[PDB]
Symmetry: C2
Subunit: 337 residues, 2 copies
């Protein structure tokens, strides 16, 4: 029995069925928090199937990294791949993947290795793969270090003809006015009681996922105040970290007048004609995508005074932003200059 | 400089303004995650003001427990209280409360003590208070142990005439059909790929806050399948734990046919004519309340087989549920019998 069995931290007066009792809590949390939603993102599933269908033949060797519960590897097998190797760092997720493979009678076709992709070596595979497959995107595109993990494998285990799926990713930002967001991230007072001192603590640094506010952008009123800002784009078959500057500057032309409460972040991943987007405009009828990825937000302070200063846009004016990145390019920040 | 200064865990290439730099991260997180939203719940603020206004005179001594950033104590002072003592377990929140008090020139009226209410003694107050004031409710009404903390103070520090605000609280449950929730908490398959094994892990035990799914009940389609179930009610001036049974049974009559995907939990707190409710029907135009409290959900398994079984309601039929509580009555679970 695992040290972290689900039943352990449940009150003894509360019933727990057998199927849950001796399963590690981390697995139950991961599957319930993320995996059902991912598996119900029908557009994500169709995207990967269609891109794979262009490349998988009975002579195709397929490697998936960050395989999780293994759905995309099942797809490669479904399309008739010569062999599939799925790599998953979580021991329990790896076992779960093996169960799904067993359930679909694909044990002869799909093998799961419990290890990080960084530990993977040529000897662990029958031959260099014809296809490298992954879905390791975050709410921020590079949020789960997708570029770093793909680059590491790309440097070591592939061959010149290997197709990397998906090929392209672009990270966007757009300044938005959003009164609902403003009302859970600021305060001025209550009647004659002054609460402005609370604003000293306003976090205009962190990137926060909409989920963490409890908010779904598609279910609140917000206004984009400019055309999208392309923060950076990568080609996963060729880009490296140094293709993204540690600091960039953007000239943002206001198309609307309003208060830029926040920068809204979303992304778009493509391969040939197929597209997987977290732009709210593309997710209005994709509730599972909005729950699993959603969008990210950073509150904006116009200056660096003792209190934050609202970023106010007037239609037709130019606004300069400085975007700073962490060394792994996973974390960024937008500041009005 | 604090060991947990905000600036510490920020990337060195990312700017942090002075107002944030040396503030403990826990304070910034607490204020940003919860306090702005609370302070923008205008109905919560009006509820407390109006109830206080019925009781506070220039001869009224007021004790607030779980005072946080101190808004309700400011209200008591505003209404002209003889004295106000605010008790707050967080050292940084206590300091923040003192700042707000300073900002409104009420230092002569409101004192903040940094300690847990359980450590509070008669000597810490000028005299037993005329009013005990608190807002320590969770998404689950008793989620932050409100009854336990009020009872402890009620047993020790008050006088016979002390008015306890707020007086009444009722916790509700209602079985709901909700397709959006279902699509992020279950799966069956993708085309000819079977994913039913994933259902072995479905968490039909935990109470989960809607925020944690990323979901706002007022922004998805759901159907209540029966009249509300009153799980328990308390009078904070007289109830104790043993007024809530460790196990209760409920006969729930289906008013609609559908799948009871989950039990939805909400509550209502009252004092005389005034009401503070987390029923989504009462929060449609209260976005800050839905973000700070929202509602809670527990997925329902109809049986205890190797896979979960949907709870299916047919209009006009009786459904028996067994509700089990933890010893502190904070955690509960509903099971179809």
């Amino acid at each position: 029995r695992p040290p972290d069995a689900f039943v352990n931290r449940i009150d003894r007066n509360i019933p727990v069925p057998a199927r849950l009792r001796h399963t590690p809590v981390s697995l139950i949390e991961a599957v319930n928090d993320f995996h059902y939603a991912m598996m119900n993102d029908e557009e994500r599933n169709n995207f990967y199937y269609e891109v794979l269908k262009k490349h998988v033949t009975p002579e195709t060797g397929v490697l998936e990294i960050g395989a999780g519960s293994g759905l995309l590897s099942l797809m490669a097998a479904k399309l008739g791949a010569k062999w599939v190797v799925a790599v998953e760092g979580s021991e329990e997720l790896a076992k779960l993947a093996r169960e799904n493979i067993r359930a679909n009678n694909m044990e002869h076709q799909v093998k799961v290795l419990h290890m990080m992709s960084t530990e993977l070596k040529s000897k662990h595979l029958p031959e260099p793969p014809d296809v490298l497959l992954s879905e390791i995107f975050g709410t921020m595109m590079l949020g789960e270090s997708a570029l770093d993990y793909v680059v590491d494998v790309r440097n070591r285990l592939l061959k010149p003809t290997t197709k990397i799926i998906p090929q392209f990713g672009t990270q966007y930002a757009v300044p938005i006015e959003c009164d609902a967001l403003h009302r859970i991230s600021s305060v001025s007072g209550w009647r004659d009681l002054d609460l402005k001192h609370m604003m000293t603590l306003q976090d205009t640094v962190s990137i926060v996922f909409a989920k963490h506010y409890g908010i779904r952008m598609n279910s609140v009123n917000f206004r984009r105040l400019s055309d999208p800002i392309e923060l950076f784009r990568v080609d996963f078959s060729s880009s490296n970290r140094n293709d993204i500057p540690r600091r960039k500057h953007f000239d943002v032309v206001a198309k609307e007048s309003g208060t830029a409460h926040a920068m809204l972040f979303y992304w778009k991943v493509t391969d040939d004609e197929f597209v997987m987007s977290t732009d709210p405009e593309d997710t209005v009828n994709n509730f599972p995508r909005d729950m699993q990825w959603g969008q990210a937000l950073q509150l904006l302070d116009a200056s660096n005074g003792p209190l934050p200063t609202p970023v106010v846009f007037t239609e037709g004016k130019n606004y300069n932003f400085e975007c700073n990145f962490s060394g792994d390019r996973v974390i960024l920040h937008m500041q009005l200059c």
